[PDB]
Structures are given as C-alpha cells and as structure tokens.
Amino acid sequence: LYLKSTNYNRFDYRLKQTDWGFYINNNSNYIQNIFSGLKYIWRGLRFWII
C-alpha cells in the first residue's frame, strides 16, 4: 500500500512553514508504527470503559 508513497504528509509542510523547533519532520517510512492512533485511543478510554 505504501510502495511509492513519500515520507512527508500535509503536517510536514505545515511544520516546515512554522518556527516550531520542538517538532521535526519524519524522514523514514511509517509502516513500522502504522495504526498507532488506535493504540492511543484505547489508552485514552482504557479506564473509562467499565
């Protein structure tokens, strides 16, 4: 699915247009950490489900 997909997203160009030195632009493929938002969603609602 990401064979010819570039590294940068929209937020990367938006960050390149800002003076936010604390954030950097991703330089590697995101296949390793794909679908991490679901992990963080679970962590956010983890103690609230029961």
Partner 1 sequence: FHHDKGYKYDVTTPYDQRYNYVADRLGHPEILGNPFERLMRLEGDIYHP
Partner 2 sequence: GNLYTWGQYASGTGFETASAVPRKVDYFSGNVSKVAMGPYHTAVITNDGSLYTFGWGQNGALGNGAKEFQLSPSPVSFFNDKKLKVKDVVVGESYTIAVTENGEVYSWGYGGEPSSKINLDFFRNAILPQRCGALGSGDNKNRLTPQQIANLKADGYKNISGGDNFATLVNQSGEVINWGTGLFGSLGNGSDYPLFTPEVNAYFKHLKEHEGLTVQSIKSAGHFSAALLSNGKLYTFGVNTQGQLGIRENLGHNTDQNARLPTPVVDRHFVGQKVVDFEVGENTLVFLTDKNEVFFSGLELAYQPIRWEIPTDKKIVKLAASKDTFAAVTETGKIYQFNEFVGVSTNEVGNDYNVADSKAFEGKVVDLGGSYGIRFAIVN
Partner 3 sequence: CIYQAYQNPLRHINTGHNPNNVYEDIVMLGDYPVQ
Residues contributing to the site for ligand CDL (CB under 6 A): 41, 45
Q: Which residues contact 28 (CB under 8 A, 6 or more apart)?
A: 7
**DSSP designation for 31:** S
DSSP 29: -
18 contributes a contact to partner 2 by CB under 8 A? yes
Q: How far is the CB of 44 from partner 2 (least distance, A)?
A: 26
Q: Give yes or no for residue 19 binding partner 1 (CB under 8 A).
A: yes
Which of ligand CDL, partner 1, partner 2, none is residue 34 near (CB under 5 to 8 Å by kind)? none
Identity of the amino acid at 27: N
